[PDB]
PDB file of C-alpha atoms and ligand atoms in Angstrom:
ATOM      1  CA  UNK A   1       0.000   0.000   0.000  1.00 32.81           C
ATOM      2  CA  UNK A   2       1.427   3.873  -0.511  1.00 34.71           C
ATOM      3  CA  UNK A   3       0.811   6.964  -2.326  1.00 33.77           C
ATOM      4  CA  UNK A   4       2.131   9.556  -4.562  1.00 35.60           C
ATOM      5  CA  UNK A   5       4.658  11.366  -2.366  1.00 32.62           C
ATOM      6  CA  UNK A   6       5.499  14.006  -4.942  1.00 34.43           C
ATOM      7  CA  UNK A   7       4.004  15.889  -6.254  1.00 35.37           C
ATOM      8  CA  UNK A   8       2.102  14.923  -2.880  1.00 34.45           C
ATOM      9  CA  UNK A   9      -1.277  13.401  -2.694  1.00 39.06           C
ATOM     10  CA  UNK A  10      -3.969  15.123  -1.274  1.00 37.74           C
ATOM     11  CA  UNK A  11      -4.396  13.152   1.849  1.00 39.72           C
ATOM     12  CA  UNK A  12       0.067  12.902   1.847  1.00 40.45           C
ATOM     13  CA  UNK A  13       0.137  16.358   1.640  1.00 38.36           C
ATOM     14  CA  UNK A  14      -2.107  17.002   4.102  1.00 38.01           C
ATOM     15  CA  UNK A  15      -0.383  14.828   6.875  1.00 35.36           C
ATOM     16  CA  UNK A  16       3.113  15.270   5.728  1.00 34.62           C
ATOM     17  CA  UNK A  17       2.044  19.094   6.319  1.00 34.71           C
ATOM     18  CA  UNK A  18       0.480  18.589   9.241  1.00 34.03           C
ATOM     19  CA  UNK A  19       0.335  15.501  10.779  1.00 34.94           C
ATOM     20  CA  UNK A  20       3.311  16.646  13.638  1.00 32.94           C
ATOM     21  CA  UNK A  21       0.534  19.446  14.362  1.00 34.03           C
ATOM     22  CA  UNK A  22      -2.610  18.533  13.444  1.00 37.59           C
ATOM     23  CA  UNK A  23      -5.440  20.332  15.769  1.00 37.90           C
ATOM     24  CA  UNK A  24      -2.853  23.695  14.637  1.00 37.46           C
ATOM     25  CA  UNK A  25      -5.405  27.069  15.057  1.00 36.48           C
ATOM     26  CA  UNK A  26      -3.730  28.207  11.941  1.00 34.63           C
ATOM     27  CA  UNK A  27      -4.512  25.976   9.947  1.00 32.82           C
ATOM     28  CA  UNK A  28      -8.098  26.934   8.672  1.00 32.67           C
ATOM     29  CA  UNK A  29      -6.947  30.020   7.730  1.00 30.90           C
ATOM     30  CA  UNK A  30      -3.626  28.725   6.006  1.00 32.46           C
ATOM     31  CA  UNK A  31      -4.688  25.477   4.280  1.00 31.12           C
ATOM     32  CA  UNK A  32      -8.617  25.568   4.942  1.00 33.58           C
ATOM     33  CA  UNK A  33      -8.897  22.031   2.081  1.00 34.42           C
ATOM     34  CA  UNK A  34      -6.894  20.109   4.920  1.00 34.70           C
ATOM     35  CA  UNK A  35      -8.321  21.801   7.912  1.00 34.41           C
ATOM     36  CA  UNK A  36     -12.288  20.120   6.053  1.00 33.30           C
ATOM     37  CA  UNK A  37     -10.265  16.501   6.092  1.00 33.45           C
ATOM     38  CA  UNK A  38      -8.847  16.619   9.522  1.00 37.89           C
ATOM     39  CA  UNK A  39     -12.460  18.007  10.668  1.00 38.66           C
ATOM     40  CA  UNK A  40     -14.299  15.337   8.801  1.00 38.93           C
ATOM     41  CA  UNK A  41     -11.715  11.927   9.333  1.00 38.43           C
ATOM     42  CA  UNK A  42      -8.456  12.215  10.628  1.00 36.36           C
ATOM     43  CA  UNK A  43      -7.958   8.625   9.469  1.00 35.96           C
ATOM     44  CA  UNK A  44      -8.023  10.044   5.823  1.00 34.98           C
ATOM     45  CA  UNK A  45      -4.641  11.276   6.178  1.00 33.81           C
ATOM     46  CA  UNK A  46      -3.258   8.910   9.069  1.00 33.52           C
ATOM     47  CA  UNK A  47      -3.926   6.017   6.853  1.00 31.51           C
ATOM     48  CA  UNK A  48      -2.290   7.596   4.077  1.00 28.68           C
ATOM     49  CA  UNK A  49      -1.789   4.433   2.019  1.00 29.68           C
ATOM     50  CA  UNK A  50      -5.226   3.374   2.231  1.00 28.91           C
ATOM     51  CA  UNK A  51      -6.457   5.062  -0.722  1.00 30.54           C
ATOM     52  CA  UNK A  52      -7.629   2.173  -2.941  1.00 30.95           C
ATOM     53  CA  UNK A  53     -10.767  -0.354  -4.427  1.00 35.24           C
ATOM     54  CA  UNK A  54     -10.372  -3.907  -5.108  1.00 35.78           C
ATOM     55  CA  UNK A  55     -11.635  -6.088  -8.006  1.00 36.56           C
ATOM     56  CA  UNK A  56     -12.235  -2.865 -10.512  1.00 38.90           C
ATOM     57  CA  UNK A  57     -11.093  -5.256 -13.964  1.00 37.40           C
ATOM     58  CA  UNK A  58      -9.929  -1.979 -15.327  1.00 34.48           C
ATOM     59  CA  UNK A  59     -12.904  -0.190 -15.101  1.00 34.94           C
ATOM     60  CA  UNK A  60     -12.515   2.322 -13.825  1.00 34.43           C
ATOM     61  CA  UNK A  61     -15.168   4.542 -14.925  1.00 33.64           C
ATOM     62  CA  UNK A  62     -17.528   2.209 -13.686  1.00 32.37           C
ATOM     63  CA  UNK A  63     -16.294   2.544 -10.260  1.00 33.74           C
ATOM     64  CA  UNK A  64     -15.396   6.271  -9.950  1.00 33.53           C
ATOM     65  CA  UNK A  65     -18.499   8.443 -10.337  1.00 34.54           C
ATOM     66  CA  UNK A  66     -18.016  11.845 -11.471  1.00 33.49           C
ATOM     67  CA  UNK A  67     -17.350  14.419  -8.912  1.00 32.80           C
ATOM     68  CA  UNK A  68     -15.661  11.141  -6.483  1.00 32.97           C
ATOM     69  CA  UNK A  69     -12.166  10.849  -8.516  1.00 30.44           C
ATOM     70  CA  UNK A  70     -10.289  12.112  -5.289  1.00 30.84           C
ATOM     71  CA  UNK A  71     -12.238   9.322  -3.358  1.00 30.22           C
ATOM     72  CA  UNK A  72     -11.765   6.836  -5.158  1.00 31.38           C
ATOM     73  CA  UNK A  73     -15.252   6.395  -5.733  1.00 32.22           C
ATOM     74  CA  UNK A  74     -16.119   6.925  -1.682  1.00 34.26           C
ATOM     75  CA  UNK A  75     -13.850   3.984  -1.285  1.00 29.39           C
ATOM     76  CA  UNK A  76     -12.791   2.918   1.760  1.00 31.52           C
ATOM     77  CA  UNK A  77     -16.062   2.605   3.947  1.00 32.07           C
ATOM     78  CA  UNK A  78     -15.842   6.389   3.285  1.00 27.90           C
ATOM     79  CA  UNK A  79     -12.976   7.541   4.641  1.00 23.92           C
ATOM     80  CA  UNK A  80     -11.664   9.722   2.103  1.00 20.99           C
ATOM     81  CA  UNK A  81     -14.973  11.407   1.396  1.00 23.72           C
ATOM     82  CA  UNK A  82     -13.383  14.914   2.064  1.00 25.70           C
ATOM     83  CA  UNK A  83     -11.091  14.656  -0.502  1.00 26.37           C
ATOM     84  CA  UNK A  84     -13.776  15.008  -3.187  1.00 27.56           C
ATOM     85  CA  UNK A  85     -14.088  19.068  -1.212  1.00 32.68           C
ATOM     86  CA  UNK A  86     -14.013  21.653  -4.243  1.00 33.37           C
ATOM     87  CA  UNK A  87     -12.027  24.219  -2.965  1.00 35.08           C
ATOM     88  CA  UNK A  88      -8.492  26.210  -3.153  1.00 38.68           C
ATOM     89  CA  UNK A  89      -5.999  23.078  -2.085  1.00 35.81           C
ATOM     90  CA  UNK A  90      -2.238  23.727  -1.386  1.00 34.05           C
ATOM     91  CA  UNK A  91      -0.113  22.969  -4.706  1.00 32.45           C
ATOM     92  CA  UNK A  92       3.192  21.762  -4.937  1.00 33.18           C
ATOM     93  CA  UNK A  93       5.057  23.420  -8.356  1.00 32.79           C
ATOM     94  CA  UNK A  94       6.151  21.282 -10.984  1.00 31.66           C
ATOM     95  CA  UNK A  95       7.920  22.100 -13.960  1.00 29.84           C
ATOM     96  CA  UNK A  96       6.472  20.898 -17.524  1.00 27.93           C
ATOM     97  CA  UNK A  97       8.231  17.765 -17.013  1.00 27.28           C
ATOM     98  CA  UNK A  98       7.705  16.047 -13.851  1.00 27.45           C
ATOM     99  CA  UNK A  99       8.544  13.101 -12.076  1.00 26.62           C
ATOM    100  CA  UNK A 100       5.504  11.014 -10.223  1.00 27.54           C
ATOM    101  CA  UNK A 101       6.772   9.435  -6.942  1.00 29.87           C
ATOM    102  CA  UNK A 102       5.387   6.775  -5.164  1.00 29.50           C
ATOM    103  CA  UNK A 103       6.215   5.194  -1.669  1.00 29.41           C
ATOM    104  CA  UNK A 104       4.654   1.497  -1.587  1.00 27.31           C
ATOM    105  CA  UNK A 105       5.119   0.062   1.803  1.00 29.84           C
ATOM    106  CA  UNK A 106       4.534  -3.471   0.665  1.00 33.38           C
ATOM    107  CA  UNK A 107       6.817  -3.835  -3.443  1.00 34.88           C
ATOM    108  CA  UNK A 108       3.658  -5.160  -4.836  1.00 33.10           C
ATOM    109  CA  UNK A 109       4.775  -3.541  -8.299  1.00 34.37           C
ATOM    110  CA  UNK A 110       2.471  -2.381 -10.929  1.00 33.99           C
ATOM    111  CA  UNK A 111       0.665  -3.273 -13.873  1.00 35.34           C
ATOM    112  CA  UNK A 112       0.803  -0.361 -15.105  1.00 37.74           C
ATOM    113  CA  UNK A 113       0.068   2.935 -13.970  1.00 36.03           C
ATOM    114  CA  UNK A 114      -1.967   6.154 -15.762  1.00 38.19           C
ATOM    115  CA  UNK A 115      -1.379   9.707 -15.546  1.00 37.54           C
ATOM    116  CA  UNK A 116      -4.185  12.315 -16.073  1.00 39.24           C
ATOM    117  CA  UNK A 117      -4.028  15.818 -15.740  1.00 41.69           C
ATOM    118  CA  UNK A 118      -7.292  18.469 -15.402  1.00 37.02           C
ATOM    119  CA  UNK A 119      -7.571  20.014 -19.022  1.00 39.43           C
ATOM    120  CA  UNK A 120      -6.643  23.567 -19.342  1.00 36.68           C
ATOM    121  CA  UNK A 121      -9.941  25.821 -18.557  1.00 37.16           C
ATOM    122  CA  UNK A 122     -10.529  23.311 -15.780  1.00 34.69           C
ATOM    123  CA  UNK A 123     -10.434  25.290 -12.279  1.00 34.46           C
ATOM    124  CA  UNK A 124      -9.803  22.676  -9.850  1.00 34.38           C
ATOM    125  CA  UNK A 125     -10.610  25.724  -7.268  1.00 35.60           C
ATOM    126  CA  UNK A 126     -14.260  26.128  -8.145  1.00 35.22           C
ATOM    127  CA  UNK A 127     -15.003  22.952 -10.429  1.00 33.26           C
ATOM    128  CA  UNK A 128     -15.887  19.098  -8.873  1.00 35.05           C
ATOM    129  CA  UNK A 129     -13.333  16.640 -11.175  1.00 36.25           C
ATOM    130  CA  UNK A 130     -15.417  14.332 -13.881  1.00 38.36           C
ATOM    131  CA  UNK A 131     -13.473  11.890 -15.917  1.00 34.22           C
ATOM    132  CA  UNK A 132     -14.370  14.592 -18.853  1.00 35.53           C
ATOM    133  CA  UNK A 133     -11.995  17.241 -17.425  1.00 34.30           C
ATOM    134  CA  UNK A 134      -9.029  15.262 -17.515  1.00 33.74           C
ATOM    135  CA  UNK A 135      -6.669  14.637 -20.386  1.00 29.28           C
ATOM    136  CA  UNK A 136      -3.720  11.328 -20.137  1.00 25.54           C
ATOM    137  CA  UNK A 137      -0.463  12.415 -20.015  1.00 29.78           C
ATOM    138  CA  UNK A 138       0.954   9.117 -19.471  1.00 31.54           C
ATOM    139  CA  UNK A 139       0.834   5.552 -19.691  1.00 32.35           C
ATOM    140  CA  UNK A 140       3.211   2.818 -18.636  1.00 32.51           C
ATOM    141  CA  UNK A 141       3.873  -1.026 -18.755  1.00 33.68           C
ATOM    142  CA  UNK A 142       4.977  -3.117 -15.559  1.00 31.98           C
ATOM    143  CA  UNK A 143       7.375  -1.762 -12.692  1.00 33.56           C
ATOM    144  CA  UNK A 144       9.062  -5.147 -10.823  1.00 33.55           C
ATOM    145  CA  UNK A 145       8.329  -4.487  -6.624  1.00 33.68           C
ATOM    146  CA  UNK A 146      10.037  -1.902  -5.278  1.00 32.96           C
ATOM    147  CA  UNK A 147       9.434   0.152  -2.190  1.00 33.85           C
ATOM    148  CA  UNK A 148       9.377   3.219  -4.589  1.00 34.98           C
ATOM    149  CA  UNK A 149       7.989   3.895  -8.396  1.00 33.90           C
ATOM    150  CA  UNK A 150       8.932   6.926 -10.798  1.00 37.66           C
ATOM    151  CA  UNK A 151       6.672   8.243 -13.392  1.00 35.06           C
ATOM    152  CA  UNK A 152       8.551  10.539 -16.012  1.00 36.62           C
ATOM    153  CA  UNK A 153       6.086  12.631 -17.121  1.00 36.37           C
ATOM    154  CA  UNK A 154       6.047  15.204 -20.389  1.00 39.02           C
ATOM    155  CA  UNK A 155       3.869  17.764 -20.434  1.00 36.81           C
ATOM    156  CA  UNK A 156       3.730  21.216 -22.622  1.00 33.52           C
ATOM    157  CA  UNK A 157       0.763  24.150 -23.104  1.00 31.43           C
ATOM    158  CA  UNK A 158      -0.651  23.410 -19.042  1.00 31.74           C
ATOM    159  CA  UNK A 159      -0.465  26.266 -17.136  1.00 28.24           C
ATOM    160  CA  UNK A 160      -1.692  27.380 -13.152  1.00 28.65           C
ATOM    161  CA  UNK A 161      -3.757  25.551 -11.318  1.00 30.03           C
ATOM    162  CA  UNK A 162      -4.347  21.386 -12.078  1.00 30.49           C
ATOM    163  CA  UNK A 163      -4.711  18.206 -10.461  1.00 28.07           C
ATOM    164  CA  UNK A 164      -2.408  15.034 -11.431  1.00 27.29           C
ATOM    165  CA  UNK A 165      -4.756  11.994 -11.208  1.00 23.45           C
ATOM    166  CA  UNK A 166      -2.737   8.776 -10.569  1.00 20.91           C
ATOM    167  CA  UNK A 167      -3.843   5.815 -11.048  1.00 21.35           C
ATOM    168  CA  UNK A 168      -1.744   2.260  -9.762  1.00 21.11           C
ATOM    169  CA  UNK A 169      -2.351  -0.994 -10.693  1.00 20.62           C
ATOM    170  CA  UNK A 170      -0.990  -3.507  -8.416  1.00 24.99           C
ATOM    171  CA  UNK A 171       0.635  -6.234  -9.055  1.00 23.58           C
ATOM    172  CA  UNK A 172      -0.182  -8.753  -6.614  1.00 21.47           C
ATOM    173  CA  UNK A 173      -3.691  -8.687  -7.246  1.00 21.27           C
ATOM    174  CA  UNK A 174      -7.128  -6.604  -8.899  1.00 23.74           C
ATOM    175  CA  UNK A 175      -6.181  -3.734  -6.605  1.00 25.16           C
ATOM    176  CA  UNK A 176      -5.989  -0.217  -7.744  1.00 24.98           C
ATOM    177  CA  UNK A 177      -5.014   3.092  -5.922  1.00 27.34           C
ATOM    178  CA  UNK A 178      -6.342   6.874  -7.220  1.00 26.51           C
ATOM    179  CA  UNK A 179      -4.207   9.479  -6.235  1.00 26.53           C
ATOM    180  CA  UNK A 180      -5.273  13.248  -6.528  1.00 27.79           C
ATOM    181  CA  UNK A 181      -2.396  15.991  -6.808  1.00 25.64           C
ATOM    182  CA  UNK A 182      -2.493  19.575  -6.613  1.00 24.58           C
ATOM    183  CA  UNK A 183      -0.242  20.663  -8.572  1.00 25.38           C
ATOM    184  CA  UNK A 184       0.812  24.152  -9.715  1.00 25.55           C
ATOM    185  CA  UNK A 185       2.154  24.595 -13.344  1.00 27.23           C
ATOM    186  CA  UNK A 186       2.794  28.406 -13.103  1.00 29.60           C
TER     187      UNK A 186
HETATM  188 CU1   CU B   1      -0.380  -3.012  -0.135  1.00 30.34          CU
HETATM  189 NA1   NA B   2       9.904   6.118  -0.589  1.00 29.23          NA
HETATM  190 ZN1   ZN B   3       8.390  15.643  -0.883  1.00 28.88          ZN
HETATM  191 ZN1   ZN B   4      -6.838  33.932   5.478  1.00 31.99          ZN
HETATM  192 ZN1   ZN B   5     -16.748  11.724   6.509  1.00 31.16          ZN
HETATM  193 ZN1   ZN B   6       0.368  29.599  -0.925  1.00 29.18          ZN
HETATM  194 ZN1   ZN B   7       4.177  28.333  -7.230  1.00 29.97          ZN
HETATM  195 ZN1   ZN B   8       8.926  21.057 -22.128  1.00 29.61          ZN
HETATM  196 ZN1   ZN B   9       7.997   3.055   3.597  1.00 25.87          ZN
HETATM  197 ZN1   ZN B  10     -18.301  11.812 -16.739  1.00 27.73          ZN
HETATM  198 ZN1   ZN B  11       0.008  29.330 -10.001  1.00 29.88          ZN
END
């Protein structure tokens, strides 16, 4: 089990952020998009790596309703609910070309994994994510078990404001994770 580490996950980001201080009075003001997750499941960002549905056969739009990419489709009994929130969540900068970092915990390896990224026009600030509003940037083949996995990423023409939708297919079984990331093109 793991996440994208960088650019971070949502739900990475928000307890790699905060995690050492998470009940801080500051942070409504300075990160209100984590202060909503911490106030609705703290668990969303304790279990960090839990972020994932079983037995999807590659469907993935079957599984992941509009507006509940971030979620994984409510996965998880739930848990990550808050993560669907429409609002103005912290970015990390990336250049054009990026790398996509995962930490697995367990080297189950992947299938494969897919890249999306919110078209241009898309304001990730004011706009729910639908599998409409995202363009693929990338697709690979397998990656043996390891404890970490590197996307190389191209991209060219995105500017400001997107989110970087992950997707990992395990290896060791029909289990797939579904990684948001703010991300901030400049
Ligand atoms: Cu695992
Ligand atoms: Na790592
Ligand atoms: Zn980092
Ligand atoms: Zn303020
Ligand atoms: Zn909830
Ligand atoms: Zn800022
Ligand atoms: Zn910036
Ligand atoms: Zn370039
Ligand atoms: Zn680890
Ligand atoms: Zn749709
Ligand atoms: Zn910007």
């Amino acid at each position: 089990h793991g996440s994208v580490v960088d650019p971070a996950s949502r739900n990475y980001g928000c307890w790699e952020r905060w995690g050492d201080d998470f009940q801080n009075p500051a942070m409504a003001d300075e990160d209100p998009m984590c202060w909503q997750a911490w106030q609705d499941d703290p668990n969303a960002m304790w279990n960090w790596n839990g972020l994932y549905r079983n037995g999807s056969a590659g469907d993935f739009e079957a599984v992941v309703p509009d507006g509940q990419l971030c979620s994984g489709g409510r996965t998880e009994s739930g848990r990550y609910n808050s993560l669907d929130a429409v609002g103005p969540w912290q970015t990390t900068d990336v250049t054009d070309d990026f790398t996509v970092k995962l930490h697995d915990q367990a080297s189950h390896g992947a299938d494969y994994f897919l890249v999306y990224v919110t078209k241009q026009g898309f304001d990730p600030a004011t706009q729910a994510l639908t599998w409409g509003e995202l363009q693929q940037v990338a697709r690979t083949g397998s990656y043996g078990p390891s404890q970490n996995y590197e996307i190389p990423v191209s991209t060219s023409g995105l500017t400001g404001r997107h989110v970087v939708y992950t997707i990992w297919q395990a290896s060791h079984m029909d289990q797939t994770y579904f990684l948001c990331s703010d991300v901030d093109f400049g």
